Amino acid sequence: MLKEGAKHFSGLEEAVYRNIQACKELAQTTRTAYGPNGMNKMVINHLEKLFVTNDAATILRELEVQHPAAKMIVMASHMQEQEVGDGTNFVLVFAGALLELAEELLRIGLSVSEVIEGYEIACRKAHEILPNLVCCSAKNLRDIDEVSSLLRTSIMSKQYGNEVFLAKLIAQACVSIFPDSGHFNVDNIRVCKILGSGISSSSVLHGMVFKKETEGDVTSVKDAKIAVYSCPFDGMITETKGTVLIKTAEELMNFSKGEENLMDAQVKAIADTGANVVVTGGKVADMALHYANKYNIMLVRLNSKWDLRRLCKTVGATALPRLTPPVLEEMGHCDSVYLSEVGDTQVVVFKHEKEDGAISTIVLRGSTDNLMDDIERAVDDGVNTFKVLTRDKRLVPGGGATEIELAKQITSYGETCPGLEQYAIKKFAEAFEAIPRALAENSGVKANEVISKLYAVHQEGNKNVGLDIEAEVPAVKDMLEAGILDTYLGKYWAIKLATNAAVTVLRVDQ
Amino acid sequence: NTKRESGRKVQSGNINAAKTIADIIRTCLGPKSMMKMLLDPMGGIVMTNDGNAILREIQVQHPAAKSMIEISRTQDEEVGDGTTSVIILAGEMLSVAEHFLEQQMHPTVVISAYRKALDDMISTLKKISIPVDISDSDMMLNIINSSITTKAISRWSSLACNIALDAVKMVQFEENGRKEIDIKKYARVEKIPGGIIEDSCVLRGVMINKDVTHPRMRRYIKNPRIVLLDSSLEYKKGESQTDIEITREEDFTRILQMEEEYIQQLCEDIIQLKPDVVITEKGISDLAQHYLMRANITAIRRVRKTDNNRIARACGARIVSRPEELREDDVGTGAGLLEIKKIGDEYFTFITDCKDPKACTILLRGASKEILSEVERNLQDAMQVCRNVLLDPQLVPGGGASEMAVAHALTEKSKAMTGVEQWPYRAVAQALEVIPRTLIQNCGASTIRLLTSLRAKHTQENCETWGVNGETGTLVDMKELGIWEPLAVKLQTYKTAVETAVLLLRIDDIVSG
Amino acid sequence: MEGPLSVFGDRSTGETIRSQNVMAAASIANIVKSSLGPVGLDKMLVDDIGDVTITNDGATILKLLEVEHPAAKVLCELADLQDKEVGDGTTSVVIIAAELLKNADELVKQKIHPTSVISGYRLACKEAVRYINENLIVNTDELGRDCLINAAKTSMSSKIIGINGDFFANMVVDAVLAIKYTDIRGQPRYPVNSVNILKAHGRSQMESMLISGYALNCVVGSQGMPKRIVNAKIACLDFSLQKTKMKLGVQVVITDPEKLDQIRQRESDITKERIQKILATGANVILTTGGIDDMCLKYFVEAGAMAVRRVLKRDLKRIAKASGATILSTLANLEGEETFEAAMLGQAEEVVQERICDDELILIKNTKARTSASIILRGANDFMCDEMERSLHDALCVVKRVLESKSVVPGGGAVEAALSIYLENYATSMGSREQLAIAEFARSLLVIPNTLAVNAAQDSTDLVAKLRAFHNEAQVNPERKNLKWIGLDLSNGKPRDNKQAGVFEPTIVKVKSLKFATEAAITILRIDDLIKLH
């Protein structure tokens, strides 16, 4: 500070200005990233690996910032995308415009604790009409059209075009078989994409898809107990050293000769352990194969952890490197163990399915994985909004159409309550139009055009916009009545989480 | 030539010069004031609550710094006051409106919000303006003494108003009391250098300082004969041209004395008859006028025919070409008081012309000739509010609560208007409320919570009538508090205010030629 | 002025000066764009330092800017010349010229004969020019429901200052009917402002009052001398009766002021003598231009005499022209003993003095030599009469201008917004150079309406969405009607619903300005070889 000491990241500009920078600075791309969008935002890794996300996190978790608040608020966006799903971009984009209001209240010079409460009581006042803005609920998981609609706004507010087809797919993923009564498998149903075919050819499979190549004669039974091992056959090459390296140079050679008898007795023990599918993260080899052909066990030639862990998870298995003949602590959890060729590619298909504990593994297909990876992002939007764990989700109009419902009132309620308080309440309800503006300016029309119409249409829950021509001029799309809705829960956490950080980050002078 | 000028840069400098000029002047405004002290490039300091006095005496610049004094002077002449309002009002509206609205990117809807805000402003004013008696100088006093205390001076609040109160009522027009239009040649003020406020009083009529300038002239002869030129003293004063010689150097001295020797005969035919008054609009030369002063014929000159015509009938007269030629007879005396006061060696002829258009040049004095001026500067604004109470008996209370009274009334029309125009019409609204806020932030504490209490007060209690106190900041009644913002003076500042900002809107571009 | 620093005088050869000129045309034409149209913002422009002017008119701006560049020079003087044609299209002809001089010059380089590219900007002009007169499609004042009457009401309703325009629907058609002057060269053109139009407020602002014959507004209240005797005749007088100095035989040569007092004395009587010489001539109403001093007037008024002094001359002349009176007949001077004859007497059914709305005029009823009419406005205040007056002016000229040349265009660049793809297809089938130039000409049309709407903040993408989405190749037809709205109303920026509106231009300046728009382009072509005087 004034002194040799005091290493400080915030205060003065930093507090006043520079926090609001990374607030609005990061809130930039989420303006494009929530609500109906195609927006191409090209993200590559430290691998510099091409990708585009319409969800903030892959932009967010990609990024690097010395601003802890901006580094924090994502955890609320996390807490969104953790508890919830699409609407994660909404988290950041809301607060940033709301936060500028406080700094302009600091351009007014308004006291922190005084601006603090104005967002909060108004939030619970927004949370007051938020259930009042519950219009419908999500009636039946068993109803595809309920879940498609559930998936629609989900995929839409990331990707508007692919919306309903996917929304019909993952609704007909029949994840409804998970009652959402307090059980739904999120990972056990996880997508396994197929590079190749179409993304319209992208479908849902039930039972665990494993795109990795079947080896050995396919499983002797189905319900075949599942030996999931990190390297049961990597070859007989040594697993045995603490650093997994050479001790003396003579050990690697013996692994060629007794390989047969090992890869006999080993997968013989796989036949002996009861596993008719042994999953080898290490390499498939002929002797294993040849003997797993004699023993008719399906080898799973090579494994991602995502393969292994899921098999470690879903099967209850433990993936372990093996040379000696192994045993099953693993067995199966799976009552049908398949090699199927899906996407035309050989696909290991494990299946056990229950109202609670099913695996319905969506098989995406498509010419590019840089398609399906962002598609999965757009798809996981609804996979999330599936899990609310109120089957009837108390849908409020999605797409921010029920904003102006709150927006008009809380800000009219704004002047109702008094003082430096009332401004932050008024400011609170002024941050609604941001997302529609952000969206309508993704379709390229200002709020005031759009929003004065949303002000003109008054109490609807219906009107909002942001990718369409009806987005442009009319300020009328149905983000309610057209099949776009959103659960109270997400919309709660949409308001709730966007409420929390914005206030809490306001304190820091360091 | 290849030149073009782009967009915001002028508009910024407009908004820049707009608000900056507004800053100190709006803090110089109000019961709690400030001072704008210039420091001349020479080292002389100039401290005035009026930046119009400061800016004209310092650098005046091509942007609205050029356009602020014009509309200030436009606000200077008409009513006589609001001088500090327009630049703090125009600097007020343009900033808050444009940028946000030019961030919404449009000139046009911004232009309309002015005329939008104009009527609601007219509306809630004319509504919540309070009619005050035209014929009661006391009911005039509380409204008229409020407009004196406005700028730098409460000193002449009682005195200037008192001198202003009855005079303006006692004025008339060509179209008729005074009332109606703004004519300030019926508001006239001529100084009495030195003197005292006790020697001063209300002169409801006109004085001619040049009527009697000497004890020799007609004095206190109360049936006047005022004479317009044409025979006794003719239109032509030209040379006699007797025995002129172009070949003589002595004739050069002769031709200049010969001008007045014919004028000598002109004022001599005044002597041959002696109509007790003589007026000449081209003025009389001295050598002839000495003879006028021998005949006790008051010599009126360097004050206009229209002036004298308005004074003659109002003091009474029969005009003739020459008294031996009577065109027709008029009334002998039109006034009740013919008074010549002497302060210094100068004689000041005060002819009270009662219920007369006249020139209404009103007797006023300070202790010295300088504070004598602050009688007039207040008298003007006093006579302004005198003519205003005559013009508009209805005039608002406010501490600037009118500037809220409109803004929320704007807002509640703005809420009713909606459209995109809602935002400009509201972006014009919140501008108005910084003016009284600066008055009551000069007071202190939270002037927002005040405006909260204000806009609470607005529809709750009242808008402008039950107001905010410029010396306090609490919610009060400016009528009860006796503070008054004159309706005309209010609206007039705004008519002048709205336009310059529209010009600054219109101008993204200038030239050097 | 970019290019080399060694040589100068518009000498780069090169395209440097040429690009400079398309830049030199730009900035000059750029100034007009924000001034383009009435919605063009008034531009405060500093002529020296304190010398400053606020102008949204291109031509007036073009007057201010001293042109070192010929590009600047060929754009200014020509829009200054189109301003001296009419002045409709000043801001128009400027803008398109910025593109077309790059369109005019460029392809002449590419040859296909040197002369070809130029007529392409002339032919597409004539194409449009032929299309111009073809347009009643929007703004029909060549015909209409009331035609010119509702065209007034509509051109009122366009500029309308109130719920009025109804009484002002008729006033404008009176303006062509009240003026019978039938302008020279066989034109039945009637100047709209040549009518006696005497602005007098009072009562309902909505009201206005036509007068049988031309009306003469005379001063009221400063004449106690009777202006009122119901008569068949006025004495139209350019003439004066003064008590003070009618003539001087006594000068400052005379040392005594008394000797003029005596000639000052006689002149007061001959005024009484003069006014009863006209009464002896038989006119119990006279229209006098003269007057006296206020002191004299105060005495002379209360003395009494028959005169109407200081009559408006433009009315006096027209009425004397209308009634048959002369402003001068037997009077060679101002003397009050001069005899008066009947040649200065007006011939009409009656001279009757009607004071209504606190307003009295000398009303010459049915002036016999020629039909005459004068519309007395009624405002709530004086500005209201001016308020309603300018809204008439839309209605006024447009009634007059369609009489100048028949039909019109739909105003604004919407009329050309259809012509663009018309003339780019009229380019397209031509091919070769003739697809190039002819399309270059039609594409350059389209900046006007946007920048028109831009000045009104209805802008560009909005208007091109508005314009040639309406405009079609499916309907290319001017028709008489709208299967496309090709009109653009500007106080607005957007095409509107008023198809009699006087805020759409007539057919006149259009055929002109396009040639001038083609002109400023082809104008700069002309230099042969190149040199530097050094």
UniProtKB/Swiss-Prot annotation, chain A:
<feature type="binding site">
    <location>
        <position position="35"/>
    </location>
    <ligand>
        <name>ADP</name>
    </ligand>
</feature>
<keyword id="KW-0597">Phosphoprotein</keyword>
<feature type="modified residue" description="Phosphoserine">
    <location>
        <position position="10"/>
    </location>
</feature>
<dbReference type="InterPro" id="IPR027409">
    <property type="entry name" value="GroEL-like_apical_dom_sf"/>
</dbReference>
<feature type="modified residue" description="Phosphotyrosine">
    <location>
        <position position="17"/>
    </location>
</feature>
<feature type="binding site">
    <location>
        <position position="88"/>
    </location>
    <ligand>
        <name>ATP</name>
    </ligand>
</feature>
<feature type="binding site">
    <location>
        <position position="486"/>
    </location>
    <ligand>
        <name>ADP</name>
    </ligand>
</feature>
<dbReference type="InterPro" id="IPR027413">
    <property type="entry name" value="GROEL-like_equatorial_sf"/>
</dbReference>
<dbReference type="GO" id="GO:0016887">
    <property type="term" value="F:ATP hydrolysis activity"/>
</dbReference>
<feature type="binding site">
    <location>
        <position position="157"/>
    </location>
    <ligand>
        <name>ATP</name>
    </ligand>
</feature>
<comment type="subunit">
    <text>Component of the chaperonin-containing T-complex (TRiC), a hexadecamer composed of two identical back-to-back stacked rings enclosing a protein folding chamber. Each ring is made up of eight different subunits: TCP1/CCT1, CCT2, CCT3, CCT4, CCT5, CCT6A/CCT6, CCT7, CCT8. Interacts with PACRG. Interacts with DNAAF4. Interacts with synaptic plasticity regulator PANTS.</text>
</comment>
<dbReference type="GO" id="GO:1904871">
    <property type="term" value="P:positive regulation of protein localization to Cajal body"/>
</dbReference>
<dbReference type="GO" id="GO:0044183">
    <property type="term" value="F:protein folding chaperone"/>
</dbReference>
<feature type="binding site">
    <location>
        <position position="87"/>
    </location>
    <ligand>
        <name>ATP</name>
    </ligand>
</feature>
<feature type="binding site">
    <location>
        <position position="34"/>
    </location>
    <ligand>
        <name>ADP</name>
    </ligand>
</feature>
Swiss-Prot record, chain B:
<dbReference type="GO" id="GO:0050821">
    <property type="term" value="P:protein stabilization"/>
</dbReference>
<feature type="binding site">
    <location>
        <position position="30"/>
    </location>
    <ligand>
        <name>ADP</name>
    </ligand>
</feature>
<feature type="binding site">
    <location>
        <position position="490"/>
    </location>
    <ligand>
        <name>ADP</name>
    </ligand>
</feature>
<dbReference type="GO" id="GO:0005874">
    <property type="term" value="C:microtubule"/>
</dbReference>
<feature type="disulfide bond">
    <location>
        <begin position="354"/>
        <end position="360"/>
    </location>
</feature>
<keyword id="KW-0991">Intellectual disability</keyword>
<dbReference type="GO" id="GO:0003723">
    <property type="term" value="F:RNA binding"/>
</dbReference>
<keyword id="KW-0067">ATP-binding</keyword>
<feature type="binding site">
    <location>
        <position position="82"/>
    </location>
    <ligand>
        <name>ADP</name>
    </ligand>
</feature>
<dbReference type="GO" id="GO:0070062">
    <property type="term" value="C:extracellular exosome"/>
</dbReference>
<dbReference type="GO" id="GO:0007339">
    <property type="term" value="P:binding of sperm to zona pellucida"/>
</dbReference>
<dbReference type="GO" id="GO:0005524">
    <property type="term" value="F:ATP binding"/>
</dbReference>
<keyword id="KW-0963">Cytoplasm</keyword>
<dbReference type="GO" id="GO:0044297">
    <property type="term" value="C:cell body"/>
</dbReference>
<dbReference type="InterPro" id="IPR017998">
    <property type="entry name" value="Chaperone_TCP-1"/>
</dbReference>
Swiss-Prot record, chain C:
<dbReference type="GO" id="GO:0005874">
    <property type="term" value="C:microtubule"/>
</dbReference>
<dbReference type="GO" id="GO:0070062">
    <property type="term" value="C:extracellular exosome"/>
</dbReference>
<feature type="modified residue" description="Phosphoserine">
    <location>
        <position position="6"/>
    </location>
</feature>
<dbReference type="GO" id="GO:0051086">
    <property type="term" value="P:chaperone mediated protein folding independent of cofactor"/>
</dbReference>
<dbReference type="InterPro" id="IPR053374">
    <property type="entry name" value="TCP-1_chaperonin"/>
</dbReference>
<feature type="binding site">
    <location>
        <position position="91"/>
    </location>
    <ligand>
        <name>ADP</name>
    </ligand>
</feature>
<dbReference type="GO" id="GO:0005524">
    <property type="term" value="F:ATP binding"/>
</dbReference>
<feature type="modified residue" description="Phosphoserine">
    <location>
        <position position="491"/>
    </location>
</feature>
<keyword id="KW-0887">Epilepsy</keyword>
<feature type="binding site">
    <location>
        <position position="37"/>
    </location>
    <ligand>
        <name>ADP</name>
    </ligand>
</feature>
<dbReference type="GO" id="GO:0090666">
    <property type="term" value="P:scaRNA localization to Cajal body"/>
</dbReference>
<dbReference type="GO" id="GO:0140662">
    <property type="term" value="F:ATP-dependent protein folding chaperone"/>
</dbReference>
<dbReference type="GO" id="GO:0044183">
    <property type="term" value="F:protein folding chaperone"/>
</dbReference>
<dbReference type="InterPro" id="IPR012715">
    <property type="entry name" value="Chap_CCT_alpha"/>
</dbReference>
<feature type="binding site">
    <location>
        <position position="89"/>
    </location>
    <ligand>
        <name>ADP</name>
    </ligand>
</feature>
